[PDB]
Structure formats: C-alpha cells, structure tokens
Design a binder for this molecule. Structure first.
Ligand SMILES: CCN(CC)CCNC(=O)c1c(C)[nH]c(/C=C2\C(=O)Nc3ccc(Cl)cc32)c1C
Ligand SMILES: [Ca+2]
Lengths: 279, 6
C-alpha cells in the first residue's frame, strides 16, 4: 500500500540498506522525505525516534512497515545545504557559525542522551529547515540506518562492516567520533577548508593521529583565540579527553560572548568557492 | 503491502 499512499517524485539519497525519496502524500498533497530501510536494535531505535522531539532534528511523521521494509515518513527540509547558504549570505561572522554549531551540539547531545550515535556526520547532512535567513539548521540522516557505503559488501548485499581485521582499532561509530566530526565542521565553517587540506592522504593520517592542529595565515588571522580553543577541545586526539556535546555547549564561544562579529565572508566565501568540489 | 503504525 506504500504506492497507494505516496507519489514518488525523486531520489534524495541512497545508501547500503536505506534510501530517501521525495514523496507527495496523495490525500493531502503535502511533501515528505520517505526513508526506506531494508530489514531488535533498529526497532528499539525507531521506538525512541517516535518519542523524541527536538527543534533541530527532522520530525518522524508516520511509520509504515512491510515484511521486508520500514518506511519512515520524515519531515522534508527545503532550506538548502549549510555551505551553500553561507555563500548566499554576503555577510558572515564567527557568531553566525557559533549559532549553527550550538544547534548541532544540542541536537546531537539529545541523540546521545537517548542512546543514538549520529554516524558519519558530514556537511551535506546539515540542512536549513526553510529559505528564511533566520532558519534553524537540521540534522537529517542519522543513526543505525545512516546512508553510507561501508566495507566491501555495502552495495552488493546491503551489509556494512566487511573491512579487513587489521584496519579498524575500534568500531568506527561512537559518541566521541560524532564530537570530533563537529570539531571538523566548526573548523571549515571559520575558514572554508578542512584541517590539513593540502596534506596528502598518507600525511593526513599522521597529522590526525598527532592532533596538533594549525590555524594558518592569512585565513585565521582575524579569528578569536576562543574559537581555536573550542575547536581544539573537539579535535582532541584522545577520545576520553575530548569534549562531549554537553561540555562543548558550555564553552564560552558557544554559551558566552567570545564569538566575534567581524565580517569573515570575504575570505571564507573565496575558500568555499575554491575548495568545495561542487562550486 | 504495509501496516501503518500507531
Ligand atoms: C546530494 C544529491 N542530490 C544533489 C545532486 C540531492 C540534493 N539533496 C536534496 O535535495 C535533499 C533534500 C531537499 N532533502 C534531503 C534529505 C532529507 C530531508 O529533507 N529530510 C530527511 C529526513 C531523513 C533523511 Cl535520512 C534525509 C532527509 C536531501 C538529501
Ligand atoms: Ca567583534
């Protein structure tokens, strides 16, 4: 009956065992993101999804279930991607970035405290709710059913984790890994490139291990010491020493008044144009 | 072929 309820309009994303479609509800004409997941932990997470409510997390509107799939009728977010919307601003400050990160931290803290790990947190996952200038930023794809293609069986049979035993020191998803990812996104939000952007893949591995991050001139010249301090606490190499979302939310750059109001759009926008593949 | 939750 899923085709009796919804008109399928386009594919918005696809992963190993889950995909998201733009759909129109036939009865009402309203648009939604339908996340289709190929079949205890998933059912327990759905139970939690049903109960939780956060202004920065896509709403679960309904669930349909077949013998082979769950169909999660989700809120559609139509405001565009984080970095596209920064390019369209014309003016941009540290406090603008801090306000986005505060929202992301709040969302991910709420997931974490309800036993959900976000997984593979990428800039593309962070979408504005509406076209309006003051729009909330939204987390969209997250949790057990995150669309990623991990290991050599992801596409073939929809099964993640086929990775040679010497490769992974630990299971690749955790609350601390989500926090590190938020550190990286913060870094790029303030300069327009990821840390160690110009290092080879092999050197990047070593640099990340070493954990001594750099804030190069001229790009970081007019950025606050507070911002750099905040970022370093999330990029911290030791996951036991790394800030949790809770601890990050209490840092002066987020919670206080250390975030600057200087226009950094000129440099950040040039770097986004230079460095983002889709520019 | 679906059951609607709730
Ligand atoms: C990136 C590939 N392609 C560009 C060539 C599509 C661009 N993406 C979108 O237009 C998009 C939109 C308008 N909405 C979404 C994703 C949503 C979304 O809007 N709601 C939602 C809920 C759960 C999950 Cl997993 C995913 C989503 C996406 C990926
Ligand atoms: Ca200022």
């Amino acid at each position: 009956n899923i085709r009796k309820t919804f008109i399928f309009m386009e594919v918005l994303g696809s992963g190993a065992f889950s995909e998201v479609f733009l759909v129109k509800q036939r009865l009402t004409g309203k648009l939604f993101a339908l996340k289709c997941i190929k079949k205890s932990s998933l059912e327990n997470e759905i139970a939690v999804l049903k109960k939780i409510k956060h202004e920065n997390i896509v709403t679960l509107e309904d669930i349909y279930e077949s013998t082979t799939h769950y169909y999660l009728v989700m809120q559609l977010v139509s405001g565009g991607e984080l970095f596209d919307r920064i390019l369209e601003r014309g003016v941009y400050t540290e406090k603008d970035a801090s306000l986005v990160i505060q929202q992301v931290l709040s969302a991910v803290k709420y997931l974490h405290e309800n036993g959900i790990v976000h997984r593979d947190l990428k800039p593309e996952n962070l979408l504005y709710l509406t076209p309006e200038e003051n729009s909330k930023i939204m987390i969209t794809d997250f949790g057990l059913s995150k669309m990623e293609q991990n290991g050599i069986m992801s596409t073939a049979c929809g099964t993640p984790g086929y990775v040679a035993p010497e490769v992974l020191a630990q299971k690749p998803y955790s609350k601390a890994v989500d926090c590190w990812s938020i550190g990286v996104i913060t870094y790029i939000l303030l300069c327009g490139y990821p840390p160690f952007y110009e290092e080879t893949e092999s050197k990047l591995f070593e640099k990340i291990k070493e954990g001594y991050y750099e804030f190069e001139s001229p790009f970081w010249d007019d950025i606050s010491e507070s911002a750099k301090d905040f970022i370093c606490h999330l990029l911290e190499k030791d996951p036991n020493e790394r800030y949790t979302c809770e601890k990050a939310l209490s840092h002066p750059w987020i919670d206080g008044n250390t975030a600057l109001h200087r226009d950094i759009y000129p440099s950040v926008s040039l770097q986004i144009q230079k460095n983002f593949a889709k520019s | 072929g679906v059951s609607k939750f709730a």
